[PDB]
Amino acid sequence: DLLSCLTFNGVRNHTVFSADSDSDFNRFLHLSIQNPLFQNSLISKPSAIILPGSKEELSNTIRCIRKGSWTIRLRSGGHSYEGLSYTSDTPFILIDLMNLNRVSIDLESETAWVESGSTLGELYYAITESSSKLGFTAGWAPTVGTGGHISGGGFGMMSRKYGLAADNVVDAILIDANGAILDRQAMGEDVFWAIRGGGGGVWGAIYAWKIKLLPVPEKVTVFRVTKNVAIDEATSLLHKWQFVAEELEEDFTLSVLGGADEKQVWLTMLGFHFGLKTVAKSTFDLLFPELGLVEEDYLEMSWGESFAYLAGLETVSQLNNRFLKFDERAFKTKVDLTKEPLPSKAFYGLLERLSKEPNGFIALNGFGGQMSKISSDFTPFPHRSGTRLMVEYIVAWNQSEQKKKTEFLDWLEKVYEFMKPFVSKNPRLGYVNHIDLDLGGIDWGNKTVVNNAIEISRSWGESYFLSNYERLIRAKTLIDPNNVFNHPQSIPPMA
Ligand SMILES: *Cc1cc2c(cc1C)nc1c(=O)[nH]c(=O)nc-1n2C[C@H](O)[C@H](O)[C@H](O)COP(=O)(O)OP(=O)(O)OC[C@H]1O[C@@H](n2cnc3c(N)ncnc32)[C@H](O)[C@@H]1O
Ligand SMILES: *[C@@H]1O[C@H](CO)[C@@H](O[C@@H]2O[C@H](CO)[C@@H](O[C@@H]3O[C@H](CO)[C@@H](O)[C@H](O)[C@@H]3O)[C@H](O)[C@H]2NC(C)=O)[C@H](O)[C@H]1NC(C)=O
Ligand SMILES: *[C@@H]1O[C@H](CO)[C@@H](O)[C@H](O)[C@H]1NC(C)=O
Numbered sequence: 085d086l087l088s089c090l091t092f093n094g095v096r097n098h099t100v101f102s103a104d105s106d107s108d109f110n111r112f113l114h115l116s117i118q119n120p121l122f123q124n125s126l127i128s129k130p131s132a133i134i135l136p137g138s139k140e141e142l143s144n145t146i147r148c149i150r151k152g153s154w155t156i157r158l159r160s161g162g163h164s165y166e167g168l169s170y171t172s173d174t175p176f177i178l179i180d181l182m183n184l185n186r187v188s189i190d191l192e193s194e195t196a197w198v199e200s201g202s203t204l205g206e207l208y209y210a211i212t213e214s215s216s217k218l219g220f221t222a223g224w225a226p227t228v229g230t231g232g233h234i235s236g237g238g239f240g241m242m243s244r245k246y247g248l249a250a251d252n253v254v255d256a257i258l259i260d261a262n263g264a265i266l267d268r269q270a271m272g273e274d275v276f277w278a279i280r281g282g283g284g285g286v287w288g289a290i291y292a293w294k295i296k297l298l299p300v301p302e303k304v305t306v307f308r309v310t311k312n313v314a315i316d317e318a319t320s321l322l323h324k325w326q327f328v329a330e331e332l333e334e335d336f337t338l339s340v341l342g343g344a345d346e347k348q349v350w351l352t353m354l355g356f357h358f359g360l361k362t363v364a365k366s367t368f369d370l371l372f373p374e375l376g377l378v379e380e381d382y383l384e385m386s387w388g389e390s391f392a393y394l395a396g397l398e399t400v401s402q403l404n405n406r407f408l409k410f411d412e413r414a415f416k417t418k419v420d421l422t423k424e425p426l427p428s429k430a431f432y433g434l435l436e437r438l439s440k441e442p443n444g445f446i447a448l449n450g451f452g453g454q455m456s457k458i459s460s461d462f463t464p465f466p467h468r469s470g471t472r473l474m475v476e477y478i479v480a481w482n483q484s485e486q487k488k489k490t491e492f493l494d495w496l497e498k499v500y501e502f503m504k505p506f507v508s509k510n511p512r513l514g515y516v517n518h519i520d521l522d523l524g525g526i527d528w529g530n531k532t533v534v535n536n537a538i539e540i541s542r543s544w545g546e547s548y549f550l551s552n553y554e555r556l557i558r559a560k561t562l563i564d565p566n567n568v569f570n571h572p573q574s575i576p577p578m579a
């Protein structure tokens with residue numbers, strides 16, 4: 085029936101479920117699974133996979149699915165930390181957007197239309213090919229899809245200068261529950277607000293984003309330096325780092341990745357400056373001489389080169405390869421936002437815990453700069469002025485380490501518990517692109533839960549969106565009153 089409808093409407097790229105492990109179905113399913121944690125045979129699988137190739141095909145795909153009784157799942161880059169783009173407890177149809185990866189750069193307006201299947205890497209590659217003086221602000225990972233990422237905000241190394249990806253969206257095409265093809269004018273300002281950070285898989289299917297391209301100098305300066313130190317020094321480095329980071333002028337970003345193994349602590353310092361190396365080095369010589377950076381650590385390169393470099397890629401060319409796997413390990417990650425400085429003992433304790441679990445690591449970023457100049461309700465992402473740091477805790481493992489899974493997750497749980505007193509409180513804040521089901525989830529098939537959906541959903545909803553939660557609910561009710569686009573943590577519509 086679904087297939088007949090798709091045919092009648094001219095949608096031809098579809099594949100039904102097959103048990104054959106070598107089937108084209110399985111191949112398409114796995115192409116964009118970015119967390120092996122959700123890859124096994126015991127996980128839910130779609131009844132069919134549809135690959136629309138145009139806005140009309142996307143519209144008609146949604147229309148056909150509604151004539152049946154399916155749960156819609158949209159996938160762009162497949163990076164959902166919780167696999168929410170390709171799993172569902174109820175029978176589902178996977179709409180994979182990988183064929184919608186056209187990027188159209190307009191150098192006369194310095195804007196771009198970006199189909200929502202395009203990855204960050206594909207976008208960055210297109211921009212750098214078009215111009216040496218234009219860039220865009222989004223996350224570091226080149227295989228992340230614009231569909232999920234911009235829908236959830238999109239934070240990266242240029243956010244202190246330019247804010248989130250979603251803060252630089254000026255139009256969009258949204259395909260609603262009825263297949264309507266809506267631009268900014270058609271969807272209205274409440275819905276255009278909601279899609280710019282309110283979370284993917286909730287409002288409809290974004291067909292394309294229109295973004296404003298942003299100035300970058302022809303040469304920027306970066307460094308990636310790993311310090312191999314002991315815990316005393318690592319603690320004092322991290323404790324000073326937090327002040328250096330949040331306070332730097334907007335033309336600088338300094339972030340950290342960290343881990344340990346018994347007495348050996350490693351801290352990888354990632355630096356970016358919107359300018360030349362003489363200024364970059366004079367700034368860090370003055371503000372953070374403890375890092376011990378030398379002249380040869382500072383590299384001058386193009387903006388596109390810098391994004392490939394910070395992502396750990398070999399070349400700018402690799403940005404354009406969406407199936408170059410970032411990593412092959414299963415993972416679980418959690419995040420905190422902070423409002424007060426972290427005491428030294430928090431870093432010491434975090435490092436002690438890392439030293440006992442070499443499969444764990446942390447990633448630390450400062451806000452400030454432009455992030456403090458954007459109002460909390462400009463877009464749905466509310467963590468602006470007053471927000472000091474974002475702290476990510478990750479544990480990752482390979483197949484050979486599978487039996488330690490329970491232990492790894494316990495370690496992460498304990499780290500998050502340890503950090504509780506030092507980070508944001510009442511409520512403990514989160515970030516929707518860092519979706520975390522530990523916070524809870526709605527079973528939309530459970531009537532008693534659905535009756536109280538708004539209160540229940542406030543647990544994660546206010547963590548992600550704070551006061552913006554109320555406006556999100558109104559926008560949801562407007563654009564998807566029948567809740568066609570839903571998942572365990574989707575914004576509830578009013579009854
Ligand atoms: C995997 C990963 C993620 C990541 C990261 C590094 C890696 C290796 N670094 C990040 C960073 O530097 N800054 C940042 O803000 N986020 C970072 N992340 C997390 C990443 O942003 C999120 O995982 C993001 O949501 C992933 O987007 P992607 O498009 O790749 O993922 P998805 O699983 O397919 O979709 C996620 C949700 O959005 C819905 N979706 C997908 N496409 C659409 C469209 N077109 N319209 C509406 N909703 C859409 C999915 O259904 C799912 O709910
Ligand atoms: C539905 O969409 C999928 C995914 O786009 C289509 O498969 C893709 O088809 C293209 C074009 O045939 C393939 O590119 C080709 O790759 C070969 C090497 O195998 C290369 O020599 C050619 O230059 C060509 O570019 C691509 O590999 C393939 N992608 C995947 C993941 O399979 C598929 O054809 C579509 N199905 C239908 C019925 O339209
Ligand atoms: C609905 O959810 C509640 C609370 O999560 C649970 O106790 C109950 O068993 C569920 N009811 C049904 C009918 O599934």
Ligand SMILES: [Mg+2]
Binds near residue numbers: 106
């Ligand atoms: Mg076979």
